[PDB]
Structure 1
Amino acid sequence: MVTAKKDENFSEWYTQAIVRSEMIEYYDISGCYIMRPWAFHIWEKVQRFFDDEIKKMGVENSYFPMFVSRHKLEKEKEVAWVTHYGDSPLPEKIAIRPTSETIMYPAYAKWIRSHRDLPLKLNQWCSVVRWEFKQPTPFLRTREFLWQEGHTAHATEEEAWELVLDILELYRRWYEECLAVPVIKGEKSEGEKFAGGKKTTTVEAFIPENGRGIQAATSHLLGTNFAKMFEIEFEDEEGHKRLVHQTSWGCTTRSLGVMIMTHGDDKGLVIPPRVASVQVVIIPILFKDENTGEILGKCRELKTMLEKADIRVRIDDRSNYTPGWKYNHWEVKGVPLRLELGPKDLAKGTARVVRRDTGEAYQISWADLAPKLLELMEGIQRSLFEKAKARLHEGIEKISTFDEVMPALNRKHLVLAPWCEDPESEEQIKKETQKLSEIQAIEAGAMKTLCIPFDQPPMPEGTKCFYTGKPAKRWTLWGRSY
């Protein structure tokens, strides 16, 4: 049973919800967590979705080593260094991948010779290690995390860019379609883009309870920069060697954290039906003074009937726990639909169904069960999305000048402001908002750009930048961030 309230101590609530639902286990090496099956099933589901999608684009899976030489890694210049095999020292220390550009792109340079070798599209599912000495957050910021990283190479910048955008659309569907989390597509500022890339696009999500934006996933136009560092060139049909144009793109188990925080409530997790490993839990009522065999046999029949409609069903027929215990047990784990069946329902040929998001209950004839539940699941999914979408739009203030920033941040909101996109102005804004935040804390940090949204509201003609007074260039989404 969860006891911390989501709107009071968000940290403790989140810890309780992910521990008591058996999603996370702690580990003696700080910054790493055990991902138990209840969470891993959701990861498997979104991984299957995305893997199918990119296979339709011709992307193929592969596996590159987890180690990279100091030489290949410093060819492009929080990295963990292997230095010893038990007793023996290594002749040269090797790094564990924080990302695989420097591991893969030498191979790319060998494999790409002609324009007929392009496009080259590879992906891998693995973990990477980014070893920060700061305190971790389960799912959101961990020292090891599972991800996928795709890396493509094209004959033209425009083809590479169209791919960047197609992948960003897949990430939007990953979050919005599967996880029911609303996100904002945008471009990262020059100061925040991937090191060595040309243009970094992102989908951004929002955590209302602490007011923070989080980078949900990233799709980079690398252009020819990595091609120059690794000499990845192809021949046209005329014989002139030309640099390939590259992309890389990544998304991680951070997505699970974002789903939990988005949909959970004071009773615990709420899993969108499209990724719940158990969509319907069947709880028979098991009075001592009843035909228990009949009740359980009807539960098995209903399970078969629902699974023919591709509904994922579990029966909890344990005699040693009361139905109230089971109600709370599966609410904590976030199963979206609970189906109750006792002697009265049997005599009436109906079932009682309770939805996890609102607690609304329905009485459904057995004949109508599968089509009704299907409808109900799509209604839960959509409702989880729309409410989250509402909380997103309520969390964003459109402003015009800088003294509107601090009030908006004290309301745990993001700000959408006309910006000149000068990089020096961004670092000045970060340091001033941090100092203003510290001074406020004394009476009881920093705001950064999150993204330059693709969906730009109207820009009146003479509009000026909210911090420098110079001509505004575009609306930019700022806030505190993970």
Structure 2
Amino acid sequence: TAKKDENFSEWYTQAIVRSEMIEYYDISGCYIMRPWAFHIWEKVQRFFDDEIKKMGVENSYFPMFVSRHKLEEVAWVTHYGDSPLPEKIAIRPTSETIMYPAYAKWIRSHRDLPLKLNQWCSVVRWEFKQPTPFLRTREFLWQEGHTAHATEEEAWELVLDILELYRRWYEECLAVPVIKGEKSEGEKFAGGKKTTTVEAFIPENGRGIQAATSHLLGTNFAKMFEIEFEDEEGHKRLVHQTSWGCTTRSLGVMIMTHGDDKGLVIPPRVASVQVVIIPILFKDENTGEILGKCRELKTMLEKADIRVRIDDRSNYTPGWKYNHWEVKGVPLRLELGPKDLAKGTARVVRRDTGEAYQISWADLAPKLLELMEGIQRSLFEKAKARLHEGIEKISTFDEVMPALNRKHLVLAPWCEDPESEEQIKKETQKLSEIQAIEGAMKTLCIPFDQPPMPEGTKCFYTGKPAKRWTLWGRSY
């Protein structure tokens, strides 16, 4: 009902509910993840988990509770039954304070390193602001990896390998283009040394959003938690640590990237159902001819590793089913009616473009595989083009507000001084308000891919010598 570009947030809420991905919940900021969405989480989880296992990272499970003093918008447990606890305990917002004392105990010698752990769990961040399903929620599923190394070089190497896996999670599984970069000093994880990130862009509201993160923590947590090892010469040294995480936010980004006015569009690589078979039957009927052929076609397609679901539910019209599965975002629908039975073909409609194909039964499995690769690729390339058109390369501050009013990001030469970022946030916030009467812009990332910087280029805000091209915009 709501059009994606006209009323984006209403479009989003409608799409995630009518698709049967999300059920809203009486406790604000928490959502039920139904199988249509949870299957996508399972797919990217399997991909990422298989890859980090190749790197020697091992899964674990640490408690969801942390004691008050060890933690020093956290949800506090204070009672069991009607009886108060001796001390109140917090639900994890992240697990540094839960894991790193164990790391201190475990690590004694250089022979104990590197230590590489991951866990899949949920965390709780009880912010009072209004939630956004998938993107900003009070409880969410994630994975957090935490490693420790004998040298800075090895930790940094892992940071970048994990960031590349996050690029693949988004770009290869979810067909979402992302930008690799480094966070500004004011936006990085405090208590880390350097934060790398992959950033995505939502064209409909012009907002950047952080997609995943990979931190070079350095030795600051080692000194805080006394994580030391004896080296090959017998001297005590601090470990060099990393941590990295990615959440069900990724599903939200996928939904927003590929959806259209009709509803969701799910990339074939992660879709719970890749091909829905719709028999063209009407109430009663059922002689078995058409459903028999559908079952044959399902078996044949499943032998080619295609995920297939026959919607043989009675008392829905074929058009009702077409719209139902389009709203859910199934990438291909296969229609089988009497005419198709009589000619030995089936009619296949791809979700992203609406293009229809008449395919002989014998040709179904290869053709569908081909179409699937094409849909996946096309979804990514169109989204990549939109990303490129949403970034304006500028040189002076007078170009900022116009570009933000076109719902674009800006790539601008920046001095990288931390005070200027706050200034810029405030100054853009003010200018925005003033227009509004008739909203702040921050750094998203300093991209790894740096265009050339002509000698003597000035920072777009301060006029001081610019160091690097920086990506700015409004953000989630």
Output the CA distance in 2 between the equivalents of 1:344 and 1:24: 37
CA contact (8 A) 2:29 2:131 kept: yes
> Moved runs in structure 1, 4+ residues, more than 2 A?
287-292
Which residue in the other structure is 2:462 paired with? 468
Alpha-carbon distance in 1 for matches of 2:407, 2:202: 9
Map Cα deviations across residues 308-329 of structure 1 (whole Å, 9 max, x no partner): 1100000011221110000000
Q: What is the distance in 2 between the residues matched to 1:264 and 1:133?
A: 29
Partners of 1:179 and 1:272 within 8 A in 2? yes
* Matches of 1:256 and 1:361, distance apart in 2: 28
Contact 1:81/1:94 (CA < 8 Å) preserved in 2?
Answer: yes
Structure 1 residue 383: Cα displacement: 0.6
Compute the displacement of 1:71 (Å). Answer: 1.8
Residue 288 (structure 1) shift: 7.2
Q: Quote how far apart the aligned CAs of 1:291 are.
A: 7.3
- The Cα of 1:384 is off from its aligned counterpart by 0.6
Q: Does 1:132 align with 2:130?
A: no
The CA deviation at 1:287 is 5.1
Supply the distance in 2 between the matched residues of 1:339 and 1:118 (Cα, whole angstroms): 54
CA distance in 2, matches of 1:203, 1:78: 26
- Tell me if structure 1 keeps the 8 A contact 2:282–2:317: no
Contact 1:126 / 1:146 at 8 angstroms: preserved in 2? Answer: yes
Spell out the pairing of 1:227-242 with structure 2 (5 A cutoff): 227-242=222-237
CA distance in 2, matches of 1:252, 1:379: 27
| Aligned residue in 2 for 1:173 | 168
Q: 2:16: which partner in 1?
A: 18
Taking the TM superposition and a 5 Å limit, the aligned residue runs for 1:97-176 are 97-176=92-171
Which whole-Å CA distance do the structure 2 matches of 1:112 and 1:321 have between them? 62
Q: Please give the per-residue CA displacement for 1:154-204, whole angstroms capped at 9, x wherever unaligned.
A: 111110001000000010011110000000000000000012000000000
Structure 1 residue 347: Cα displacement: 2.1
Deviation at 1:348, TM superposition (A): 1.8
Partner of 1:72: 70
Moved more, 409-418 or 347-356: 347-356
CA drift at 1:218: 0.5
SS in structure 2 opposite 1:216? strand
Contact 1:80–1:96 under 8 Å retained in 2: yes
Contact 2:277-2:309 at 8 Å conserved across structures: yes
Give SS of 1:282's match.
strand
The answer to whether the 8 A contact 1:96-1:128 is kept is: yes
Tell me by how many angstroms 1:83 deviates. Answer: 1.7
Structure 1: runs of 5+ lacking an equivalent: none
Is the Cα contact below 8 Å between 2:283 and 2:314 reproduced in 1? no
SS of the counterpart of 1:292? Answer: coil
CA distance in 2, matches of 1:288, 1:124: 50
Please report how far the alpha carbon of residue 20 of structure 1 lies from its aligned counterpart in structure 2 after TM superposition. Answer: 0.8
Asked if 2 retains the 8 angstrom alpha-carbon contact of 1:198 and 1:221, the reply is yes
Query: Does the 8 Å CA contact 1:429/1:447 hold for their aligned counterparts?
Result: yes
TM-score, with length taken from structure 1: 0.97
Q: 2: CA distance between counterparts of 1:78 and 1:395?
A: 34
Q: Give distance in 1, aligned partners of 2:77 and 2:283.
A: 62
Choose which of 257, 263, 270 in structure 2 pairs with 1:268. 263
- What is the deviation of 1:7? 0.7
Match of 1:303 among 298, 320, 340: 298
Whether the 8 Å CA contact 2:183–2:197 is kept in 1: the answer is yes
Distance 1:158 1:291 in 2: 67
The answer on whether the counterparts of 1:286 and 1:292 sit within 8 Å (CA) in structure 2 is no
Identity of aligned residues (%): 100
Residue ranges of structure 2 left out of the alignment (5+ in a row): none
CA displacement at 1:292 relative to structure 2: 3.7
Q: Distance in 2 between matches of 1:424 and 1:8?
A: 37
**Stretch moving more, 85-94 or 430-439:** 85-94
Q: CA deviation at 1:290?
A: 7.4
Counterparts of 1:22 and 1:344, CA distance in 2:
32
Aligned to 1:306, the other structure's residue is in SS state: helix
Q: Distance in 1 between matches of 2:339 and 2:28?
A: 52
The superposition leaves residues 22-43 of structure 1 with CA deviations (integer Å, 9 ceiling, x where unpaired) of 1111111111111111111111
Cα distance in 2 for residues equivalent to 1:24 and 1:425? 41
Q: Give the secondary structure class of the aligned counterpart of 2:104.
A: helix
Count the aligned residue pairs.
476
* CA pair 289-450 structure 1, distance change in 2 beyond 3 A: closer
Over 3 Å counting, the alpha-carbon distance change for 1:458 and 1:320 in structure 2 is: same
Asked if structure 1 preserves the Cα contact closer than 8 Å seen for 2:283 and 2:315, the reply is no
Q: Secondary structure at the match of 1:246?
A: strand
1:48-81 deviations in Å (ceiling 9; x for gaps): 11111111111111000011112221xxx62111
Matched residue SS, 2:288? helix
C-alpha separation in 2, matches of 1:78 and 1:262: 30
User: Are the aligned partners of 1:418 and 1:464 in contact in 2 as well (CA < 8 Å)?
Assistant: yes
- 8 Å CA contact 1:290–1:343 kept in 2: the answer is no
